[model samples]
Target: GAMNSSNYAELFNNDIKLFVDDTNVYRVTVHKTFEGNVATKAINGCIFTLNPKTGHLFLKIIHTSVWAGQKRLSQLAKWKTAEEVSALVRSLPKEEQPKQIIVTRKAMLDPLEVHMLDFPNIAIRPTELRLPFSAAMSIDKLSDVVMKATEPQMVLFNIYDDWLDRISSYTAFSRLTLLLRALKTNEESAKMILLSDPTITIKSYHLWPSFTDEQWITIESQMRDLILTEYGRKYNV
Candidate 1:
């Protein structure tokens, strides 16, 4: 059916991973909803839920890599998980377009242990379920890095202006680590600041559930500061 294949393709980039428990074997049912176009809607959107277990999967569209060449797409790695349903989270991801992201402090000792590093202890963050991240700065400022930085990394802003719509607690957590690492965050104390709190956010970070407080607040404050730091040295800010 078209629906089945589209849903499968939705999660497929390099792979599709569904992590439910320590064993990474729990099953989840999701209702796939959409907002998009083959030609009209510039971007698309899908939303679903998690049981007492999982459904929080939001996908981001990426294209800030090699293009404008006669070179064709290269062959690469892929895997299978269940019922021909497939997924994988790996070391040093991104030849480009990573749909499932899990970043942890665990060293890459064995491929198997990587499965457990992201759950229960790191469990998926709900903030990303609502949307992809932004530097929370204007596009003009974020564009400087896309143009100036030599490294092949595009953290929040999209250069190709591709379609997108999702991320995770683990995925959301991943984004924070990315900024810290990319910005060359020097302080050990600064690294733990954001991961310390879990909150609700929609296309932006907010201390939710009303009259709330937290380090996610501290971290969000600095995300702006870090964005400023990310590429300012290239030119005068």
Candidate 2:
């Protein structure tokens, strides 16, 4: 008997999507063994997948802009300045802590890079996840950013620290703005680059599988394009 494709569709349809604040949302679904030869091959630690039929690239970009404030809290433990966050990261303990340290591109550190107009595509390698939780808390002397004074704040602080670590370690999509920039350089060249190897997916220029509603909207709002498409989503499942 021919395999029933719709069987998979029914499973997805039965899954429920969890929504937060009318804007943030996620879907609750069963964990299935990772399958699909093509799809499995495309999983690059961070990014999702890129579909050729549709020019849409799926990826995940975290909107944790407030993460800086959370970080400031961690630094306070060591009485270090935000500028010193990276240096002090190694000194802190690693047991049960959120991994916050990130490797920013040397270009990103320069003031001019912010306005360079071609910042995203630049391959900025991410450092291994290692956040200085105690350091962040120590520097947050005023405790304003993390709101220092809630009852049981100490316990909650530790929990928050752990949560931040888990979230950071989780696999998410990479941004495609850089590839889009490259595309503008030469449309023919860009398409060639993307299509050159459909088998090898690049996270910085692909759509992620099973993106939550909030995740999708956030990406669209910031990137100015809804890269996800029916074809891309279907290809993943």
Using TM-score as the measure, which candidate wins? 1
**All models, RMSD in angstroms:** 19.1, 23.2
User: Candidate 2 — worst ten consecutive residues by lDDT sum?
Assistant: 18-27
Reference-based TM-score of each model: 0.22, 0.18
Q: Looking at model 1, which ten-residue stretch has the lowest summed lDDT? A: 75-84
Give a tens-digit lDDT track for model 1, residues 10-124. Answer: 3333343332111111112334346542322111111111111122322211222322231321110011111111122333253422333231111111232334354323232
Question: Which regions in candidate 1 have their CA more than 4 angstroms from the true location?
Answer: 1-167, 170-174, 177-179, 182-213
Model 1 residue 186 lDDT score: 30
Q: In candidate 2, residue 79 scores what lDDT?
A: 25
76-114: candidate 2 lDDT, tens digit per residue: 212222122222222335441112212221221232223
Residue 71, candidate 1: how far off, in angstroms?
31
